Symmetry: D2
């Protein structure tokens, strides 16, 4: 019974994108067994951000995924001790980000130690010009590679003017504790959304919904 149906979330992100330093605090709440989660974010340093806030949002826990009984839930099995993930975000225009989160737990509260770094965004590109609207929904492919749980995603940012700006995700997920049983090949559907924000995005309210599945023919 280590994970409770209602959990609190504390987060701190430190980052550097195109040479710009920043620090962002996060405070949120979530329902792990329903695969849903919400968070309020506040830029504590480096505001106002000179880049598109949307690039950060997926760095702000796969614990908040609705897993069917017939699929192994690696993420919930990682607790109480916790787990870490490392991610690479490869954008179609040469922009490249890397990110990390060390996730632990105390009582009803998840703690997130997050780092986010980025370079090679063109000065006239959508991220530096803040021409982003939202991430499209996605389907993350979960598989094991040399004993490490890995997720690959084809992601896309919707742009002003109804074009799309493509990004490839790769994430590695590692439990702290030895001998957590790895899952079989499966899928995780995503939908992430900014519900509200102030003008400079110094304050942002974020929401995520995510569900695991086995694909066709078992839709």
């Amino acid at each position: 019974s280590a994970i409770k149906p209602d959990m609190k979330i504390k987060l701190r992100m430190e980052g550097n994108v195109n040479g710009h330093h920043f620090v962002i605090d996060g405070d949120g709440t979530g329902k792990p067994f329903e695969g849903k989660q919400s968070m309020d974010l506040e830029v504590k340093e480096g505001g106002p951000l000179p880049f598109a806030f949307d690039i950060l949002t997926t760095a702000f826990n796969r614990v908040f995924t609705k897993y069917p009984d017939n699929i192994q839930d690696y993420f919930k099995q990682s607790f109480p001790k916790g787990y870490s993930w490392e991610r690479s975000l490869t954008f179609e225009d040469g922009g490249i980000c890397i990110a990390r989160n060390d996730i632990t737990m105390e009582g009803d509260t998840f703690y997130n130690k997050v780092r986010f770094y980025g370079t090679n965004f063109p000065a006239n590109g959508p991220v530096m010009q803040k021409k982003t609207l939202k991430w499209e929904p996605s389907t993350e492919k979960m598989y094991v590679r040399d004993g490490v749980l890995t997720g690959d995603i084809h992601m896309a940012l919707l742009l002003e003017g109804n074009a799309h700006y493509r990004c490839d995700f790769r994430t590695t997920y590692k439990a702290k504790e030895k001998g957590v049983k790895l899952p079989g090949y499966h899928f995780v559907d995503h939908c992430i959304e900014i519900l509200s924000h102030d003008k400079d995005y110094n304050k942002v309210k974020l929401y995520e919904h995510a569900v695991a599945h086995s694909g066709l023919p078992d839709n």
Copy 2:
């Protein structure tokens, strides 16, 4: 109204993989509005194949996709005149394939002119050693890029010994007729499966099921 609920499928593939020439004939049936399709394949030249048959199977029509009414069906709109697609298959171990299909229609029957080429498969790899079992199911991301309909997929071959061998698909789809309406960003779930085969895979029965959707939260 050109596409009928029950369609016949005639196919011919010429190919060359790691220097090995081959020709494969195909004869099948399908239900376009249900997104389901079947085919019998016969190796006419270059049998027995020295590589894994599984690499070819997705080259053996997105017409056979179940589209909801709220998503534009580019593929069914492309007929009677037809359409063509070009695909790149980038394998994790440097192996690389390209393929193409020109698709036309006469009365009841789809005609498929298919080409398939491949190089740089390591001699000790799963393809050249025929250590493949099946493709996992997939979710193809459909989007428009510079006016061209494009699908990217994270694909995986299940190996003997329950490991996975990763491949990235990219496909472009082009209607023959000029003014066919492009769809919005959406998804196509896949499941492709070899139902039966003889020992050397000179005769193979193939099946595909595919459904289009808009992701979460509408799933």
Copy 3:
């Protein structure tokens, strides 16, 4: 040894690019120990070509490389029996080509059986619109990977309007005979040029100069 300071070259290429079939014959001469080589090419089928001829030109023998004594010459050691290579050409705009050449020798003459395939060139792109001028010179990195001699190159096509169109080469080189000694990590500088051509590029005269080296400080 088998290789004479002046050699003849016979070549035959069969190809398919963006669905377009073609056949090209080649007749040339070269100085292996000087790393220089020349060839006359004639399109025998599929002329006039609807794509940029420049794409093909590196498929038209690393035997013609000037090797210093302190670097192992894998290519000249492969004869009389010969060798084969397989290449992938990954273009910046998604265009993708693969090629292969089986090279044998009789008396003073090299024989080249060549295949060249390509897909996913955008209809609007520099290749399909024949906006290419030349390949820039290059430096190919030669190294051994899992017992196979491999060369990676950062290539670039100079475009009309003085822009550049980038392509990544990867080539594997395999001697036909067992136990040809592999070289250490080294470099091969290239310069390939079209000396002349008729209007439709049905007839083309081609030239290559190539020199092996060990990099700094020995330049």
Copy 4:
């Protein structure tokens, strides 16, 4: 006139690799017009480093390149005001690094503000296990892309046991001052070398030699 034939070099690097924080100070000298440079490095925080020191070494100025007169020297023209570069290091085994350097000048001294970040290095890989010997020499391809000076390199680390571990560099170089003339397509040969180090690599002496050129036939 801003660049003198003998120059001093002051450097500070902050970094984070696989979650490990570190700070490294650097003090060196160089001969810009000869393309030669050397530096003493001292780990001030996070020592001893749990990863291979070699990965950092190219982050420790293209000013120190020997440019011929017939090629535009963007880097020396960027002073006194200075310039910045941003780099991506994509390793063959999924490991990925990013780096940045803001370079300024006062009197005879260059000042380097450097950041270096890395994730997704496998725990059993050559970087995390410190199985690295040296970078091979290299040839960087310099070209302009959408008005930005860019360098791509095929790099390789020599491993214990005489294998190679491949990495792709991409770097963007941006002068601080408006209207510094961009160069034409050209090449920069490199050779970087650790001259000495203590057991834990808390103290390291580094050397670089680099020469620009136009390739064959003028090599």
